[PDB]
Amino acid sequence: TVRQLESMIRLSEAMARMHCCDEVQPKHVKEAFRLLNKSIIYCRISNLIVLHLRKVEEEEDESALKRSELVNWYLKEIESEIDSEEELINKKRIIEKVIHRLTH
Amino acid sequence: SALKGVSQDLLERIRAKEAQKQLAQMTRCPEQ
Amino acid sequence: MPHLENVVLCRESQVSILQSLFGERHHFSFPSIFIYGHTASGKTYVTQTLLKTLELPHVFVNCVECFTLRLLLEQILNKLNHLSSSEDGCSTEITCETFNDFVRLFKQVTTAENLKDQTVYIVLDKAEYLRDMEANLLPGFLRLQELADRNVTVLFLSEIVWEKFRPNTGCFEPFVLYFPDYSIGNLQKILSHDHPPEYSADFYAAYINILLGVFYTVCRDLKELRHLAVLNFPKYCEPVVKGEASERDTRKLWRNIEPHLKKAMQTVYLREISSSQWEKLQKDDTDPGQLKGLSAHTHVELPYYSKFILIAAYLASYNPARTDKRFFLKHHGKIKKTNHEKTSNHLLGPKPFPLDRLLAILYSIVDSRVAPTANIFSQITSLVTLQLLTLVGHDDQLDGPKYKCTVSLDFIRAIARTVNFDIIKYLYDFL
Amino acid sequence: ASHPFMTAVDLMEASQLCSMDSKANIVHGLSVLEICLIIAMKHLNDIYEEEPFNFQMVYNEFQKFVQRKAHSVYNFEKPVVMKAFEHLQQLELIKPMERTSGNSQREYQLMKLLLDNTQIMNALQKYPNCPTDVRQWATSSLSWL
């Protein structure tokens, strides 16, 4: 109720406390949102993929192919956040495995 | 994409720049 | 060919099996062949085509149409004298009822040159209701080759597996054949073969793949998608007739059809959804609050003193016969038992209640007083025909019979919100 | 008309088709609805040590798996649950204690199971097209909400 809602605001306020961020950001409040769902309890890798593509395929005003012959179109909105090292060769053969869930 | 699509070199020198500075800091020495 | 292989493109390993058991006319086989499948339609449609192609003597009888052994053995001979010889037998009937005389009269019919050294096929449609009668007719077909001494092959097309009709003294063990299941790669091609002449091949097959991925998790038989895809044609070919969409465009027709499928995919295995569901909304120009068609049982017409009968009787079938003073006389002393939660209460089913409970709860829900006249107790027996309350097995006498319940609280909340009523605050399980 | 002699190949294939598990191959030609049902009563058998139970208890856990999942189109309605369970009635996968009530509705069944806790686990790797979010729920003993 109200006693638990005021505690969630403090979690988002203290989330950007170590990152040296002044104003709060929407990407920091959703971090504690997942802990509230799993509070009463390689599968974690498959969770951050479904929750990411759902927020992208809901803003295109048009629709092209990007079905079977254009499997590399779904890699554009995800390579922007990639800025490490091993997420280019090792994770290259992993993209074709997650997309197989819709094919079957 | 990256290998078969576009960005053949734009997303290639990112790891090369990070791997170049790591080979220059090997003489950092732990006790220093 | 048009209906033997084009119906299911996954029988390449079964045609060479049945044809190997046939051979010629003077070739024999097992007296009983048990073949069980799924949906009770895939193995039946292929039987009517394979037997009508090679032109072989065969009949078709059913064990569900007749509940007696006298009529089952009579229909077999009625469809046999017409093809026993080259000419008809003057349309003569057979009068028999003894099971021992069945093997005697069958030998006299199979004496002509047409059924002398030929294979006779006996297809028993729906062979899963033979255990209801006697336990002696099961081994009769397993040992028919020894008794009748004729080339008779009995076929079975039942849904139940073989290891379920085992008698007490055992029987002959024949060959159990299992047809392969409907493959995902072969079901897509059989649903697009029956293309109408209004379209083509590639243009028509594209509208099937878009519906298979969304109906594979909720349906599996091929006969269901055959009668459902035809009904979706009048509600999908709208941009084609108007001319706003040209040919070859499978990436722009899914956007306009998406809102048209959210209110139709939740009704699987139901052929009621047709051209009469949305027609009921046209006759509701005044107050569209009534729901007719999609969950029409939620919004129905109830009398004034009868709508409270189903509401009051719902609490009398899930509450103890003693802990009922909490909703009438609040001047008692509650113990607080726990205020256990996962008990069998409200989950085992309707509790048997007589008539003394209904005569003390309807006077509290209504506002003013009500006189129990003749039309007050009329909703007790009239609702039995309407299928709203069940009886405790056999019929009782008159000294206060017992009744139960039938329908849960799926539609009780919809009626209570119309005559200003709240039932959630009256349940005993939800403290 | 193309076998002049015999070999050890025509005799091995004829002995396997008449000895396979006829109680484990009937689940391959199913969808996901009835597949999740037979696993639902399997989890209830571990907590209820030999005792009957009706069908309304299976509906309590149906709306429990809908959580911890993103908002998509996988959610159903309500009448599909009784339609998916009725498909197992014509297959004789459940058996009453001794009496089938005539006035019983879609709530009082007290049925059980006609399988075992061995072939149900070995029939998962051979089933075609197994989702990743469904197979993990069958192997585990329900530890999440």
Curated annotation (Swiss-Prot), chain A:
<feature type="modified residue" description="N6-acetyllysine">
    <location>
        <position position="27"/>
    </location>
</feature>
<protein>
    <recommendedName>
        <fullName>DNA replication licensing factor MCM6</fullName>
    </recommendedName>
</protein>
<feature type="modified residue" description="Phosphoserine">
    <location>
        <position position="84"/>
    </location>
</feature>
<feature type="binding site">
    <location>
        <position position="6"/>
    </location>
    <ligand>
        <name>ADP</name>
    </ligand>
</feature>
<comment type="subunit">
    <text>Component of the MCM2-7 complex. The complex forms a toroidal hexameric ring with the proposed subunit order MCM2-MCM6-MCM4-MCM7-MCM3-MCM5. Component of the CMG helicase complex, a hexameric ring of related MCM2-7 subunits stabilized by CDC45 and the tetrameric GINS complex. May interact with MCM10. Interacts with TIPIN. Interacts with CDT1. Interacts with MCMBP. Interacts with DDI2.</text>
</comment>
<feature type="binding site">
    <location>
        <position position="3"/>
    </location>
    <ligand>
        <name>ADP</name>
    </ligand>
</feature>
<comment type="similarity">
    <text>Belongs to the MCM family.</text>
</comment>
<comment type="function">
    <text>Acts as a component of the MCM2-7 complex (MCM complex) which is the replicative helicase essential for 'once per cell cycle' DNA replication initiation and elongation in eukaryotic cells. Core component of CDC45-MCM-GINS (CMG) helicase, the molecular machine that unwinds template DNA during replication, and around which the replisome is built.</text>
</comment>
Curated annotation (Swiss-Prot), chain B:
<comment type="subunit">
    <text>Interacts with GMNN; the interaction inhibits binding of the MCM complex to origins of replication. Interacts with MCM6. Interacts with CDC6; are mutually dependent on one another for loading MCM complexes onto chromatin. Interacts with PCNA. Interacts with LRWD1 during G1 phase and during mitosis. Interacts with NDC80 subunit of the NDC80 complex; leading to kinetochore localization. Interacts with GRWD1; origin binding of GRWD1 is dependent on CDT1. Interacts with KAT7. Interacts with ubiquitin-binding protein FAF1; the interaction is likely to promote CDT1 degradation.</text>
</comment>
<comment type="function">
    <text>Required for both DNA replication and mitosis. DNA replication licensing factor, required for pre-replication complex assembly. Cooperates with CDC6 and the origin recognition complex (ORC) during G1 phase of the cell cycle to promote the loading of the mini-chromosome maintenance (MCM) complex onto DNA to generate pre-replication complexes (pre-RC). Required also for mitosis by promoting stable kinetochore-microtubule attachments. Potential oncogene.</text>
</comment>
<protein>
    <recommendedName>
        <fullName>DNA replication factor Cdt1</fullName>
    </recommendedName>
</protein>
<comment type="similarity">
    <text>Belongs to the Cdt1 family.</text>
</comment>
From Swiss-Prot, chain C:
<dbReference type="GO" id="GO:0005524">
    <property type="term" value="F:ATP binding"/>
</dbReference>
<dbReference type="InterPro" id="IPR047088">
    <property type="entry name" value="ORC5_C"/>
</dbReference>
<keyword id="KW-0158">Chromosome</keyword>
<comment type="similarity">
    <text>Belongs to the ORC5 family.</text>
</comment>
<dbReference type="GO" id="GO:0003688">
    <property type="term" value="F:DNA replication origin binding"/>
</dbReference>
<comment type="subunit">
    <text>Component of ORC, a complex composed of at least 6 subunits: ORC1, ORC2, ORC3, ORC4, ORC5 and ORC6. ORC is regulated in a cell-cycle dependent manner. It is sequentially assembled at the exit from anaphase of mitosis and disassembled as cells enter S phase.</text>
</comment>
<dbReference type="Pfam" id="PF13191">
    <property type="entry name" value="AAA_16"/>
</dbReference>
<dbReference type="Pfam" id="PF14630">
    <property type="entry name" value="ORC5_C"/>
</dbReference>
<dbReference type="GO" id="GO:0000781">
    <property type="term" value="C:chromosome, telomeric region"/>
</dbReference>
<dbReference type="GO" id="GO:0005634">
    <property type="term" value="C:nucleus"/>
</dbReference>
<dbReference type="InterPro" id="IPR020796">
    <property type="entry name" value="ORC5"/>
</dbReference>
<dbReference type="GO" id="GO:0006260">
    <property type="term" value="P:DNA replication"/>
</dbReference>
From Swiss-Prot, chain D:
<protein>
    <recommendedName>
        <fullName>Origin recognition complex subunit 4</fullName>
    </recommendedName>
</protein>
<comment type="function">
    <text>Component of the origin recognition complex (ORC) that binds origins of replication. DNA-binding is ATP-dependent. The specific DNA sequences that define origins of replication have not been identified yet. ORC is required to assemble the pre-replication complex necessary to initiate DNA replication. Binds histone H3 and H4 trimethylation marks H3K9me3, H3K27me3 and H4K20me3.</text>
</comment>
<comment type="subunit">
    <text>Component of ORC, a complex composed of at least 6 subunits: ORC1, ORC2, ORC3, ORC4, ORC5 and ORC6. ORC is regulated in a cell-cycle dependent manner. It is sequentially assembled at the exit from anaphase of mitosis and disassembled as cells enter S phase. Interacts with DBF4. Interacts with POLQ.</text>
</comment>
<comment type="similarity">
    <text>Belongs to the ORC4 family.</text>
</comment>
